Amino acid sequence: LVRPKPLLLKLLKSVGAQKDTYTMKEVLFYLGQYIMTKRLYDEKQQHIVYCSNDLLGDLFGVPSFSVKEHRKIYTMIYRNLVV
């Protein structure tokens, strides 16, 4: 299991996930499903994600990120969770 952050809990709860603990797949599932259904991806650049002004930006500390940076995505996630 993993331990999410209390900021992220507010986003998760908006996707139905009101629990304080979830699985590794679930954390990224609720996140992915949210952006996918929100339309927060560029049509021309579906590999770029806007975190600026969303709850993801608040916790990442960056205005935008690239999905291409898998090694960065994992470090951002592991800084949110407890190993």
Partner 1 sequence: SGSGASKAPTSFAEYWNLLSAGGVCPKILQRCRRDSDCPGACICRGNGYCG
Name the residues that contact partner 1, by CB under 8 A: 23-25, 28-29, 32, 36, 41, 46-47, 67-68, 70, 73
In contact, 2 and 27? CB cutoff 8 Å: yes
Minimal distance, residue 7 CB to partner 1, in Å: 20
Instruction: Decide whether 5 or 41 has the Cβ nearer to partner 1.
Output: 41
User: Token pair 């975190």 is at which residue?
Assistant: 51
Instruction: Decide whether 7 or 28 has the Cβ nearer to partner 1.
Output: 28
* C-alpha to C-alpha distance for 51 and 46, rounded to whole angstroms: 14
Minimal distance, residue 49 CB to partner 1, in Å: 9
Task: Supply 2's token pair.
Answer: 């993993």
Minimal distance, residue 36 CB to partner 1, in Å: 7
- Which contiguous run of DSSP H or E holds residue 50? strand 48-50
